[PDB]
Amino acid sequence: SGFRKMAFPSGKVEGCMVQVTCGTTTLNGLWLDDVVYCPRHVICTSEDMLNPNYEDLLIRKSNHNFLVQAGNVQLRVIGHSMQNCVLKLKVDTANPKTPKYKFVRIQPGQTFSVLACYNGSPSGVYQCAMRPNFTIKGSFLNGSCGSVGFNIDYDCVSFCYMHHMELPTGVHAGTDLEGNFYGPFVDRQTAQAAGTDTTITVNVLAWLYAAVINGDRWFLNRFTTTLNDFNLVAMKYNYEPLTQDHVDILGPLSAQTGIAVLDMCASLKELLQNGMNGRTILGSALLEDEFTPFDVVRQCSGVTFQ
Amino acid sequence: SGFRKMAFPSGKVEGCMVQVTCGTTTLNGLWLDDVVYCPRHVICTSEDMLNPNYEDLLIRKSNHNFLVQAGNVQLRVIGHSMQNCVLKLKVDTANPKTPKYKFVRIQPGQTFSVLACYNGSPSGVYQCAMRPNFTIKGSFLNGSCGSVGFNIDYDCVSFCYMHHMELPTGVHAGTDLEGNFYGPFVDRQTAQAAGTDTTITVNVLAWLYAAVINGDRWFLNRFTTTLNDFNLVAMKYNYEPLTQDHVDILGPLSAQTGIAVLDMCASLKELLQNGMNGRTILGSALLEDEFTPFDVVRQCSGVTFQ
C-alpha cells in the first residue's frame, strides 16, 4: 500500500554522465558508445548568449578545444559535429558502461525521471511531467545543463530530455537527444513566452484510480456524465479535453477498481466545481497530474527492471 | 530555480541488492563484503507469522537451506547468524561492487531515500521521512521486504532502514541494519498501535525558507513571536515543539534569506491559525514536513556525490 512520486533507479544513467569543457564553459555530457552529447551553448561565452551565431562560433573551435572528463578518465575528441541544438563529440574510447538505449521524443503529459548533474557528477533524481506547453517544472541550478531525463523499460534506457535553459519565469526548457527543442524555444538569452499551462486530465483520472486502490473513496459520487458534458466543464477550468484514446488507456484501471471511466469523470467534475473542502486525496490537497496511467499500474503492480 | 522531492542517485545501492530464498519465502537482501543482510522472517511460513518462535525456527535451518542470487550469480552460504530482527548470511564471495558504507540509526524527522526492490531487482526510488511515531509512509507491495533506505555523504553510503512489514493501517515499519526496530513494533502478524503522528516543525520551517529562496513570499507577515508563544500554538495543532537546537540548525537559511527564525515562526503561526485560504506554497496546498534543513541547502546549493 501507499503511493509516492517514484523515480526510476538511476544506476544505468550515472555511468554515462561526463564533464564537457570548451574554453571556460563547463557543463554535463552524455557518453554513449564513442559519442558524447551535450548542449551546443557550451561553445559560447556569457556575452555570446544574447545573440549567438552558433555556426560562426563553432568554426573557430577545433577537436583539441574540447575537454571531456569521465571522473578521472580523460577522453580525447577526434571529431565534432552540430546536430540542431546538440553537439556530438566523437571520442577515442567507447563507454564500457553503455546500456541498451534508444532516443525517444515524448509527447506532452508523459512523465520521466531527471538525473540532475553538476560537473559530470550526480546530485539527485526526481520524477516530472512534460507540461502541455512543452516546459518542465524542474529543480535546476547553474551548471545543470546537459542533465538528462529518461525512462526505463526492462533493460532499455529511453533518453527523452536534455536540459538546456531556465526561462526568466523559472520554468525549464530543453531538447530531445537529436537536438530538437520541445516547444517553440530557442537557445539564446532573450525573453520567450511559454503558452498557457493546462492540467493533464487523463493523468488526474489515473491518480484518482490510484486513490481508490489505496482506500480513499470519499470523492466517489452517485452521479454520472457524458464525454461532451465533462469536456465542457473541463475546458472551463483549463483542463485538457478527454478523448476516446484516453478512455481506452484507462481501461485496465477501470477493470481493477470496477469504476467506469465516465463514472470517475463525474466524480472529477464535482471536485472541479465544488472543490475538495479542506479534504485530501493521497495526502494532497490539490488534484495531481504528474502520474500517467502507466505510472499507476507500474507502482501498484510492482514492475521491476534490470 | 525550482524545488522537487529529490532522492539520492541509487547506483551505489543497486549493485548491493540480492534475492534471498529460504524454503519457499523469497525477499530482498543487502550484500556488503561477504555478508548478506535480510529480514529474519524469511525463515517463516504464512502460518508461522501469527506467533513465530524465531529461535526454534532458525535451528531447523542449515546453511544449504538458504539460496542467495545476485542476478544470475549464485552465492553459497557458509555461515548464518541472527542479530536481533535481521539474519546475517556469510557467503563465499565478497561483493566487488561494495561501496564505502556505514550503518546509521537515524532520529525521527530525518529523511532518506528508499530503493524499492522485488526479487532482488530495483523498481523505483523515492524520498521519505521517519515520522515522529517511527513509521514511514512508503510505497511497498508484497515482496518488498528487505528493501533499504539510505543517504549518501560524498562517497559514503549510509544505510539507515530495512523494510520489514506493513501495518494493518497501511503505514510501514522496519529496522536499522543491526536489526533493531524503529519504534515499539515486533515482527509478527498482530494488531500493533502506532502513536500519534505529529508534524515535524523544523522541517516545515526549512521548507518555508526554500519557498522564499524560490520567490514565494506572500506568507511573510509583519508580526513576530517568541519561542514559548509559538510552541503554545504549535502543540495545539499537533506540531513538534521547537527547541534552541532547531534554531541553531536553521541558522544558515536565516542568513541566506535575511529572515530571522523567530520571524519565520510568526509567519507559520498565522498559517496554522488562519490557513492558506486557497493559496499554494511551492506548488502545494499543505504545509510540507519531509524536507530537512540539510535537504534544502543541498538542493538550493547543488551538492554532488561520487
Ligand SMILES: COc1ccc(Cl)cc1CC(=O)Nc1cncc2ccccc12
Ligand atoms: C540565461 O542563461 C542561458 C540562456 C540561454 C541558454 Cl540556451 C542557456 C542558458 C544557461 C541556463 O539557463 N542555465 C541554467 C539552467 N537551469 C537552471 C539555472 C539556474 C540558474 C542559472 C542558470 C541556470
Ligand SMILES: COc1ccc(Cl)cc1CC(=O)Nc1cncc2ccccc12
Ligand atoms: C502481514 O505480513 C507480515 C507480518 C509480519 C511481518 Cl514482520 C512481515 C509481514 C509481511 C509484510 O508485511 N509484507 C509487506 C510489506 N510491505 C508492503 C506489503 C503490501 C502488501 C502485502 C505485504 C506487504
